[PDB]
Amino acid sequence: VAFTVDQMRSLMDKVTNVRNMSVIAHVDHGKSTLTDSLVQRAGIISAGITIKSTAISLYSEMSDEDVKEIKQKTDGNSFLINLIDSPGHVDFSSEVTAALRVTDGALVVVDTIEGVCVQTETVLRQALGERIKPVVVINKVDRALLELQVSKEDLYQTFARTVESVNVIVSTYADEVLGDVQVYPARGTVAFGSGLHGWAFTIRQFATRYAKKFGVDKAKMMDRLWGDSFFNPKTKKWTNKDTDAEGKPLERAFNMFILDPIFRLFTAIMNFKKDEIPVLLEKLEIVLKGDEKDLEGKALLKVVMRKFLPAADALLEMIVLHLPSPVTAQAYRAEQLYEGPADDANCIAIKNCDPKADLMLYVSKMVPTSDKGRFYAFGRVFAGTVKSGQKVRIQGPNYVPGKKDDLFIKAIQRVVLMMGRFVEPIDDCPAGNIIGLVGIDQFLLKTGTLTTSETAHNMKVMKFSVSPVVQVAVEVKNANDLPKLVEGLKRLSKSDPCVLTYMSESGEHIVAGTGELHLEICLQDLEHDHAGVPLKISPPVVAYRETVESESSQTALSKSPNKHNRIYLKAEPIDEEVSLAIENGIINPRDDFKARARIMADDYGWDVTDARKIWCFGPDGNGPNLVIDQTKAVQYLHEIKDSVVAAFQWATKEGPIFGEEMRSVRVNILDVTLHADAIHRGGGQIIPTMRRATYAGFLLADPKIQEPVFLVEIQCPEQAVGGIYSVLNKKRGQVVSEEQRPGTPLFTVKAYLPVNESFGFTGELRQATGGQAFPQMVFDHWSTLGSDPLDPTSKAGEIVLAARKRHGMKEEVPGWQEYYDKL
């Protein structure tokens, strides 16, 4: 249906009638199919800046009698449903949590024949740990009839077992504090149908239908239409005994009143019994129009069933009548979603879904848009009201009410509805609703908390990292498609904040990701969309760091090509603390040099004299590497500063060990001799001089390499936990902690895992746990290898040689003499 902005806001203020929910289903189970049926039936449409579809809005209208069945506060017969997009596979764990966290209900799709698969089971655990209420739909019933050709009782028992498996999971992992959350067909919390053909039903739908033909209230009718209820055809009498007086078998009500009608349509139509179909159709009052009256086989069956039991209706009914509203759910989810005090003014405001309190908006992800390369924030208002122009406290991951770290007090350019692929600007948006924001992508990388109270803590943070720990070289197979790849990378880089595309000195096109899989999907998107050209891709390579462990053995000296200029310097390690402070914005390149020096001096033990003479950071003008001017009375020193900084940018981008970035490297310029005439100390002269002196100084300062390390968090059932440790113990894994969820038998194992040991990790963990483990890993820290990188046999040296060969460099690492002044 098409709505105006006024209408949307109108049914957005009625948060009691909103359903924040997602669809939990395996892709091979027609997840996309059932989602389509929902959109084509209840999808909302607006009365030019497009976005990647992240959420769909649905509108459902019900009767006054229906609204009374809802066991939670309601207002009116209008209902706003937010269908939050879900990942296509479990492996995308971090974003599987992202979706669930902003949803209160979940439509869980299971299979008729295969029942509940391993992954749907795992995701359900997570959804339950998030305190999300489930409603089940048994899909692909079509197959049970057409292929297996099962009997009505056999099909019934199949559903019974399926529902049994689901509730085994539900009663085990659903939190006690939610009450009985198990699903019961007789209660209308389980639907049956076939997404393919587009039909589905609930016991309530058939109960409403027969309610009159039996002079009975809907409640006790659907109570009978499942379980051991039998309507004797001969006596016209209801019974709880599956045999009559003479000992003959009685058919249960489900089989008799629900399955039988459907079974007859399937038989009459697929057997081309042209004389039965008409009689059977009028019986159920299924009227076909013109063209439809000629169809046959599956073509006809599809139209008949679609008109008989529209799938979307059976699903919407459950979603509205049984899924919790923002009001109902936030009352028991708030404590879980707030990283602060339970009785806080803000946590309280979240339980009450208070639209008047200080803002508490959750940004679950950043969405690519058509408005330049900018990203639109996506999330949910858990408290207060978000407004266009409203100034808000952008609280990032590292934020803590104490410090002012990771804090940005900016203004919301625009508040917009995420109508699937399109954007709709609105004045404001009360608590309980899902919404998008404009002008925040430069303050938030992916997730964070927006607040208007300077005493509010972050909301349950989702750990991410932009560190490109894995990368590959991209290369067109046909040299004419080059431009298509160049624009393709420029495109790829824009569709994802955590993807990196750059050119190495040698001119190679590099794509860097946050993990094996993440980089995998990026290369697939590039070769089919962003570029669409046949590409030659080198095997995945891990990103390392080059660093020093001591001060240079001696002063590093280098001379310019024309022999008229000289730079004397020395390299020394920077403390991890300081490197962390730089990487975390505390020590800032853009900061005032005097305010910044105070911090390095007071908080980090730097001579304020040195901290005041920082010439630059690097690489990329902000890395954890520094140049310090410690020269005395050097004439025209400032006239070569731009050149020296430039050299530093290149030197720290690709170090002398094997082309890897530098980290924690301090360079002290001790002395400089220059030609009196500027004509003889331009960029061409100084740049190579500074760069070579740096390499020399580096090589003299006890060279080493650093490897990236993940922090992995694994959810897993007690039984299969043993598989976790089994895998970690052959990948230099290191257990951080092993916590158990109070009631449930769910464990959370945390461990450090070297990134170069993580290739094919989820695959192995999958097997070792029977697919019951739920992995989540983010880059945590860099680790300096003990071994000598210059030794080809040592571990660090083994890495170096392989890489140097791969790059076509001279196998052996150059000595400092190579870059030192030749004399």
Binding site: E505, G507, S558, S560, S643, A646, P688, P814, E818, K822
Partner: protein
């Protein structure tokens, strides 16, 4: 064509493309077979190498006294090596490694090659050079070889008219992309290129 057989030759920071030592040996031989002779090396930047090898050496303005204008080369590749790089950074400050080139002349031009012990490009040597070549500077269809500086290595200046009659091909001696500004390591000079790099004997006395 004097580049021998194989793929299209191009210049890159990764090194000269489609230019093996064996191809050089072929190109060099075929050059002598056609009456050409090696006279030294010229180091420069990539685009310059592209222009020189495929468009030929062409006269241009240079920063010195008019009387010393010409095409500068060196018999010792280590000297020419120092010029095989960008002289100016690009927008971001990138300074790329260049390429070494081998310079050949028609043997018919050898009667015009002279040497001196004096330091070239200086007013105290002009008089002696003008004596050797039998005419006032600048050089024309003649060349002068001498110390590029006091106690320094030898350089050769080809008069512009003579320079335009050169044939220039790539060297098998690579520059170092990871050590721009460094000096040429003799061990990186292919022994087989060294074997074909002897210089002609230049006259110490005028014609």
């Amino acid at each position: 064509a004097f580049l021998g057989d194989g793929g299209d030759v191009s210049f890159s920071t990764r090194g000269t493309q489609n230019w093996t030592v064996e191809r050089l040996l072929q190109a060099h031989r075929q050059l002598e077979e056609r009456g050409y002779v090696f006279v030294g090396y010229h180091g420069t930047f990539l685009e310059a190498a592209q222009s020189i090898v495929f468009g030929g050496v062409r006269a241009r303005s240079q920063d010195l006294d008019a009387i010393w204008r010409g095409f500068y080369i060196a018999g010792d590749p280590a000297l020419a090596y120092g010029y095989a790089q960008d002289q100016e950074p690009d927008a971001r400050g990138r300074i790329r490694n260049g390429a070494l080139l081998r310079v050949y002349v028609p043997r018919s031009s050898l009667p015009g090659f002279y040497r001196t012990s004096l330091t070239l490009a200086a007013p105290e040597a002009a008089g002696e050079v003008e004596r050797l070549i039998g005419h006032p500077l600048p050089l024309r269809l003649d060349a002068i070889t001498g110390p590029a500086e006091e106690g320094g290595r030898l350089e050769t200046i080809l008069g512009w008219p003579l320079a335009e009659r050169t044939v220039v091909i790539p060297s098998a001696i690579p520059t170092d992309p990871r050590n721009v500004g460094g000096d040429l390591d003799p061990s990186s000079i292919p022994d087989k290129e060294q074997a074909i790099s002897a210089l002609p004997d230049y006259a110490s006395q005028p014609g």
